[PDB]
Each structure stands twice: as C-alpha cells, then as structure tokens.
Design a binder for this molecule. Structure first.
Ligand code: HEM
Ligand code: HEM
Ligand SMILES: N=C(Nc1cccc(CNCCc2ccc(-c3ccccc3)cc2CN)c1)c1ccco1
Ligand SMILES: N=C(Nc1cccc(CNCCc2ccc(-c3ccccc3)cc2CN)c1)c1ccco1
Ligand SMILES: C[C@H](O)[C@H](O)[C@H]1CNc2nc(N)[nH]c(=O)c2N1
Ligand SMILES: C[C@H](O)[C@H](O)[C@H]1CNc2nc(N)[nH]c(=O)c2N1
Ligand SMILES: [Cl-]
Ligand SMILES: [Cl-]
Ligand SMILES: [Gd]
Ligand SMILES: [Gd]
Ligand SMILES: [Zn+2]
Lengths: 402, 405
C-alpha cells in the first residue's frame, strides 16, 4: 500500500503516495532496518532522461504538449548521436532545485524554490573552476545576507575525467595531526589537510586555519588555490552574558558550501556541483564544536561555567551545550550573518511537509537527520513520522577522488 | 553479507551477524524506510518451529546443547503440541524467556540490566481479584521503598477456548486525563481513553492533574473489573528544583515505578498477553517527554516564563534552557526522594557497554536508533554516534491491540 504517516503531537494522519515512485533502493529490508546508517548503456540513460523530461514538463503544466514531445525527441536524438545529452538551462535549474527538494536529510527544504543556479558547464580549467567558486562564494555570502546557490560544473562523460572539488566544503578549517596522535584544529579535516600539504600548501598551526581548495580539472592532478581572506566571512563567537566566552577564541565561517556531493539529473551526473545555503545553529554549536570527535570543547566551556563535571546527573553537558548554541546564534546575529536556530528550522520543515503533502503526496525525510542533535523532542519534527526514500533528481554521496 | 555498523565517534566498525537470525519482518523495504514509525505492524507446525528454536536457545544459554535434557525437552514439547495443540514452559524456561525478551527489545536503552530481572510466575492465576494480588505484590517488590528492582509478572498464556487475561491500563501507574469542554485536558492527555473507560466502568473520577487511575483487570471471558491501588503502594515523587525555588509550587509530581502492562510477551510461540514489567525511569522520560511534550503536560512555557527567559523569540533557546532545568528537577527530586532513576548520559553510556557485550555474546544487538537516542541532548550522548540495526528477535515484547477495540 501507501505508508500511513502519523504526527503524534497533533494526531494527524497522511499517506505518503510519493514513496511509490521511489527510484533507487535504500538499505533496509523487511528483515532489518538500516535507517540509522550514514552511508547506505543508452537504454538506461534514455529511460532516466525521459522520466526527468516528463517530470519537468509535468511541473510546468506542459505534459503532452508539442514542446514536451519536441524535447523528448531532441534528447533521444542526442543520446543516439553522442551517447549523452545536454540539459537546457531551464532544465538544469529545475533539476538542481528538485535534487534539493528531494534530499531526505535536509531540514532546510522550505527554501527549495529559492536557489541561484550558476551554470559553469562551459568550465575548462581548474583556474576557471576557481573563478566560478569565488563568484559563488561572493554571491552566496552577500556580506552576511546569505543566499542559497549552486554552481554546476561540466557533467561526467565517457573517456574524460571528472571535474572534482577535493574539499568536502569550500570553507574548511585545517586539522593538524599532532605527534601524540591528537588533532589541532578540526579532526574532520585531517585527511584533506594532509592532502593540501602534500600538494604544496604551507600549513598554519592554528585551530581555525582556512584550508586552500584542491580543484581537479579533467585528467589533471588537483591544483591548489588559496581563497582570498576577504572572500571568507567568519564569525568570532561570543556569548551575550558569559563575558569570558569570547576569550576562548572560537569562530566559525558564515557559508556552508558543500562541495563533494554528486548532482544527478535525468541520468546525467555532475560530480562537481557545490551548493550553499546558510547554517542551522546546531550544526556549529552542537556538532562541530561539541562532538567528541570534532572540536570537543564541551568540557572546556563547562569548566568556564563552573559546572559540576563529575556527576552526569547535574546535566552539565546539556547546560554547556545550550550556552554554546546560544553563543553561536548570538554571534551570527551580532555579525549580521544569516543563521537559523533548530526551533525555527524544524517549524519551517513542518510547513514544508504540509506543502509537499499537497504538492506531491509526500516528502522523503530521514528522521534521524531531520531531528536536531539537541532538544530533539522539543522540536515538532521529533513527533512526526517520516518516510525515507530516494527520488531523482538527487544529491548523492560519491567516493573521494583520491 | 551482514550489515556493517560504524561508531562515528571512535571510528570502530562491527558486523551485525545476529540480524541474520531475525524471526519476523519489520516495516521497511528497499523502496522506503519506515524506521521512524511508532507502530510498524498491525499453526501447529509454526508453533513447533518457534518452540524448538526457543528450547534450543534455552539449552544453549545454559551450555547444555545436545544433552539428554536438551533432547528430552524437544521431544516432550513436540509430543505436547501434538497431543494438546500447545505446551507449557518450565519455570526456568519462563525466566530465561522473559529476560531474553527484554534483551531483544530494540527500543530499550536499559538493556545492560537484562540479566537482572525478578520473574513472578502468575500462570496459575484464575481471577481478576487474583491478578490484582499479583500486581500489588509486583508493585511492592519492584518499588522496594524506592530502591527499584526490575520485575515481570507473567499471567497465564493465551490458550484456545478461553479468553485472555488482560490489563487494560498501559501502565500499572498512570495519571488520569480528564477531557474538558474546551478540548483541553486536565491531567495526562496520554491517558484520556483509559480514564474514560475507568469512568464508564464505575470509577468516580477526581479532578486533579495527578490522579492515579484504577486498574481495569480482565479475567478470561469476563468484563474488566475495577481495582483501586492502595495509595501506600504507589510511591510518588514531588518535583522541586535545587535552585529554582518556585518550581516546587508548580505542584508537579511523578510516580516512582514505570510498570508497562499492555505489551504481549511472546516466548517460543506462546503468547502472554498480560505480563507487566517494571524497571526504573530514565529521567528524560519524565522531564522531557511526559512533562514537556506539547501533547502531554506541556509545562515548558510556564517554566520558562517563571525562569524569566525571553520566550518571544526561539533563538534565545528558552525551550532548551527550560527543558534542561525541568530534567534537573526530575533528577534532583528522585535522588532526594531516594528513588532509583538514571540520567540519559549514564543510561546511554551503559547502553554502549551493552552493545559491546552483545557484539561479543551474540554478534549484534537489535536497536532502534530513534528510540535509543534520548529526546534532549541527543548528540551529547554516545548512542547518537552509533549506527544501529533494527530487527525483530524472539522471545519478544510486542504491541498488541487494546482489548476494548
Ligand atoms: C537555505 C538554508 C539551508 C539550511 C538551513 C539547511 C540545513 C541543512 C542541515 C542542518 C543539514 C544536515 C547537515 C549535516 O548534519 O551535516 C542539511 C543537509 C543537506 N542539505 Fe540542506 N540546508 C539549506 C540549504 C540547502 C541547499 C541550498 C541545498 C542544495 C541546493 C541543500 C542540500 C542539502 C543536502 C543534499 C543535504 C544532505 C547532506 C547529506 O546527506 O550528507 N541544502 N541541510
Ligand atoms: C532497569 C531499568 C530500565 C530502564 C532505565 C529502561 C529504559 C527504557 C526506556 C527509556 C525506554 C523507552 C520508553 C519510551 O520512550 O516510551 C524503554 C523501552 C522499553 N523497555 Fe526498558 N528500561 C528498563 C528496564 C526494562 C525492563 C525490566 C523491561 C522488561 C522486562 C524493559 C523492556 C522494555 C521494552 C519492551 C521497551 C519498548 C517499549 C516500546 O516499544 O514501546 N525495560 N526502556
Ligand atoms: N546548512 C548546511 N549544512 C550542510 C548541508 C549539507 C551537508 C553538510 C555537511 N555534512 C557533513 C557530514 C559529515 C560530518 C562529519 C564528518 C566527519 C568525518 C570524519 C571525522 C569526523 C567527522 C563527515 C561528514 C560527511 N560524511 C552541511 C548547508 C550546506 C549547504 C546548504 O546548507
Ligand atoms: N523506564 C521505563 N520506561 C518505559 C519502558 C517501556 C515503555 C514505556 C511507556 N511507553 C510510552 C509510549 C507512549 C507515549 C505516549 C503516548 C501518547 C498517546 C496519545 C497521546 C499522547 C501520548 C502513547 C504511548 C504508548 N504508545 C516506558 C520502563 C518501564 C518498564 C521498565 O522500564
Ligand atoms: C550514526 C548516526 O546516523 C549519525 O551519528 C547521524 C545521526 N543523525 C545526524 N543528523 C544530522 N543532521 N547530521 C548527522 O551527521 C547525523 N549523524
Ligand atoms: C515519530 C517518532 O517515531 C516518535 O516521536 C518517537 C521517536 N523516538 C522515541 N523514542 C523514545 N524513547 N520514545 C518515544 O516515544 C519515541 N517516539
Ligand atoms: Cl559544517
Ligand atoms: Cl512513562
Ligand atoms: Gd573562576
Ligand atoms: Gd534560586
Ligand atoms: Zn528502515
């Protein structure tokens, strides 16, 4: 049947009819659920291309029109002639927005219709890739008034290497392996930091050293590019009432610009299509700064707050985490950099689910990722049953290029 | 092959081979995951296969696989099923099966304790009055003046020709929820339906926020019978906060003993529709879900206003701050009352140890990530960073239909 989906806070029931159109298989079976796991031929391409073109023409209310038929014939004729095809720019924009819309782990999808799409499919060199990336960062950052954007580099094609951005985000802090095995800076980025050093980057020795970009043009080794510091907007973290918090020297960057995912549209694959929006504050204050395998600053802050750190039942961890999240929100607002707290974001996502139920009959959503990492059940999404499935166009994980 | 399971905090990787023994289907398919749904679902040769599997589990657990006793029990069960359509557990098997069902429960974070369970054999029970006796003795034993002891009381199994024993209440201790004319609820909205059933069956209702409900106890083929718990049996904890002195004036309280009474215990193909079990609370159950859920007592905004927090904008994180202090109050108050309680940090740390133990003992552990991760401070706990595999093993505790529907 269609899954029955309940909201336990309100008692409201929906049926996800959209899931019946799920393209690819996920990791679960009737025997066991793997929903919590982080990492789950012209005929085939033409089949995906036709489904996408049909999708697009349905969305603009032109199904079965002459333009629809003409576009299908164009795609068939191009695949027959070349083994691949080119998206019209309107289709690329639609495809990128749909891939965002379809992303089950994105709580920010209320924004999905508002996406600046930079068409870099004419890109030829890593140097030009860098210029596109800087223009993206400048546009999206917008002096702190963040604007969602994606830059689409040339698609994958047979007999030619991919464009790749080796960095997982356009802005990443270095992580330096110390002699005793610990990390200075961001442990998430030890591997890319060492790759940057291997390719000729002179490392810093700070906790928040912005990494250079490793940009790979087809069939070339990656090339190192330094981001101009004026392009990388950062927010020093301070707290509204804990005056010592600023002295901790914590900071984060304004622009979450994810650069290692593959964008798939109509069977075409764009291995370099960095996209950016703005942060939800728990990403910074809870995960990046408090994860034990990231900056792991929770106990430092708890020491500064004079909390009792050797009984768990004092909830010192929870109190310290809240004040770090408060500091993130306060600091981005003070700096006039767009940020959304986890209450506002989850409330907007509930509105999104409602919109999508009416628009498409459901919404693929990954509960474990949508529910924020603090205050889970204080947010409405905790009480919302969700159905997780894969629709295309999509953003996919892909192997690291090295 | 077997699911590869990663802990992202440590980077350690295991394979859940136990999942290959999953005995029932869950709700997910390769096309879509339904892991976040609360309620996923809903003979002689099938009974024998489940019985043989269970007997094999039992004899393996005591390291007597292949013994004459093992073979005799298999033959006896097969003969009993052939002759009577069913069979009876030996007392030792019942104890093992109850503990296994707890061990197998994917949504239970407290399973480090699974070997420590007092099993009361009430399979000789004959009436609702006798059910009440067993229940009162369970509550008394389990409460233990606040030094809580995990226990289960197993009433007679389902059997053809005879209705079931059922406890209609979802827990042995529940606060009444009284629907008001404006649609609001006085008391616990979770219990509106059982409250109305108690009233329909002759209970004179209170009008408080924390009125302990009577028990509706159903003997086979009888309408349910109403029993009031002696108030001295029901240990309760008044809630205060160590530094927010007005908090005590909220008049909030909760009960000591979580005693779940509406789940079905399945052991070796046998079904025990009345098998209430109790342990102790994890503090987030009370302080985060029961008190702060918008559809439960919903106290968050009133606490936040009394804390003088700015409730006009969400980015002050007033909800988070108020919820933390409510959880502090629960922990402080139970400790002050000398009633066993575990905070979510301690509980999840112990569950990580349990996962480690079970990897070695059985090659895996069925776990429901969405239920194991606490409802506040999720990623501050180790379980958030632990990938989990959810699957159904038997013996098991299962949901079952309400007996009035
Ligand atoms: C506009 C504001 C946005 C907000 C507040 C937001 C929020 C988030 C958050 C909190 C996550 C989880 C990330 C993590 O935990 O690591 C996420 C995931 C994701 N976002 Fe959004 N997002 C926004 C815009 C966008 C845009 C513009 C795109 C693409 C066009 C996008 C695509 C995705 C994808 C594909 C994921 C899944 C990543 C994965 O599976 O690892 N998001 N988003
Ligand atoms: C000893 C201390 C224990 C602690 C701290 C504990 C903790 C928990 C918690 C926090 C939940 C989630 C409940 C909810 O959110 O509604 C749970 C569920 C569960 N517990 Fe445990 N538990 C304990 C003992 C037991 C015992 C003794 C049994 C049975 C013999 C048991 C069986 C279960 C089952 C079957 C569930 C799943 C309920 C469902 O699926 O709705 N637990 N436990
Ligand atoms: N607002 C936003 N955010 C956002 C959205 C999508 C993806 C991400 C980044 N997702 C990172 C997931 C991750 C986290 C930690 C580790 C890691 C690995 C090794 C050691 C320690 C940590 C690895 C990964 C990727 N597998 C952020 C945003 C970005 C663009 C638009 O909106
Ligand atoms: N420590 C323990 N705890 C625990 C363990 C298992 C089960 C439960 C109770 N599980 C409650 C689930 C629930 C929550 C809210 C509603 C509800 C329904 C309608 C409106 C509002 C709320 C309904 C249900 C039952 N489906 C507690 C414990 C009990 C026994 C041993 O250990
Ligand atoms: C193991 C577990 O899936 C992992 O820790 C997940 C849980 N939920 C998440 N949710 C978000 N938004 N981001 C994450 O990285 C994760 N990590
Ligand atoms: C919709 C969602 O499944 C529901 O709110 C779940 C989430 N996780 C939970 N986790 C626990 N421990 N208890 C619950 O009742 C729930 N409820
Ligand atoms: Cl990030
Ligand atoms: Cl409860
Ligand atoms: Gd000091
Ligand atoms: Gd005070
Ligand atoms: Zn699943």
């Amino acid at each position: 049947k269609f899954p029955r989906v309940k909201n336990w806070e309100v008692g409201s029931i929906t049926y996800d009819t959209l899931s019946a159109q799920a393209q690819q298989d996920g990791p679960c079976t009737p025997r066991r659920c793997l929903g919590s796991l982080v990492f789950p031929a012209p005929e085939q391409l033409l089949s995906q291309a036709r489904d996408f073109i049909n999708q697009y023409y349905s969305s603009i209310k032109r199904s079965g029109s002459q333009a629809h038929e003409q576009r299908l014939q164009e795609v068939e004729a191009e695949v027959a002639a070349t083994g691949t095809y080119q998206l019209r720019e309107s289709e690329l924009v639609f495809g990128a927005k749909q891939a965002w819309r379809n992303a089950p782990r994105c709580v920010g999808r209320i924004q999905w219709g508002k996406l600046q799409v930079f068409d870099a499919r004419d890109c030829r060199s890593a140097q030009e890739m860098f210029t596109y990336i800087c223009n993206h960062i400048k546009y999206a950052t917008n002096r702190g008034n963040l604007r969602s954007a994606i830059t689409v580099f040339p698609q994958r094609c047979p007999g030619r290497g991919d464009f790749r951005i080796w960095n997982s985000q356009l802005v990443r802090y270095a992580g330096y392996r110390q002699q005793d095995g610990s990390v200075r800076g961001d442990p998430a980025n030890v591997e890319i930091t060492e790759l940057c050093i291997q390719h000729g980057w002179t490392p810093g020795n700070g906790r928040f050293d912005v990494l250079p970009l490793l940009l790979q043009a087809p069939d070339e080794p990656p090339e190192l590019f330094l981001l101009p510091p004026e392009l990388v907007l950062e927010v020093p973290l301070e707290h509204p009432t804990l005056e010592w918090f600023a002295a901790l020297g914590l900071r984060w960057y304004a622009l979450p610009a994810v650069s290692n995912m593959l964008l798939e549209i109509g069977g075409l694959e764009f291995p370099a299509a960095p996209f950016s929006g703005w942060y939800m504050s728990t990403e910074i204050g809870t995960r990046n700064l408090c994860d034990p395998h990231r900056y792991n600053i929770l106990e430092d802050v708890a020491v500064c707050m004079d909390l009792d750190t050797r009984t768990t039942s004092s909830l010192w961890k929870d109190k310290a985490a809240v004040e770090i999240n408060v500091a993130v929100l306060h600091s981005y607002q003070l700096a006039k950099v767009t940020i959304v707290d986890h209450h506002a974001a989850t409330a907007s996502f509930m509105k999104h689910l409602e919109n999508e139920q009416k628009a498409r009959g459901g919404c693929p959503a990954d509960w474990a990722w949508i529910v924020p990492p603090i205050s889970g059940s204080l947010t409405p999404v905790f009480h919302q049953e969700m159905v997780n499935y894969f629709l295309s166009p999509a953003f996919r994980y892909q192997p690291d290029p090295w």
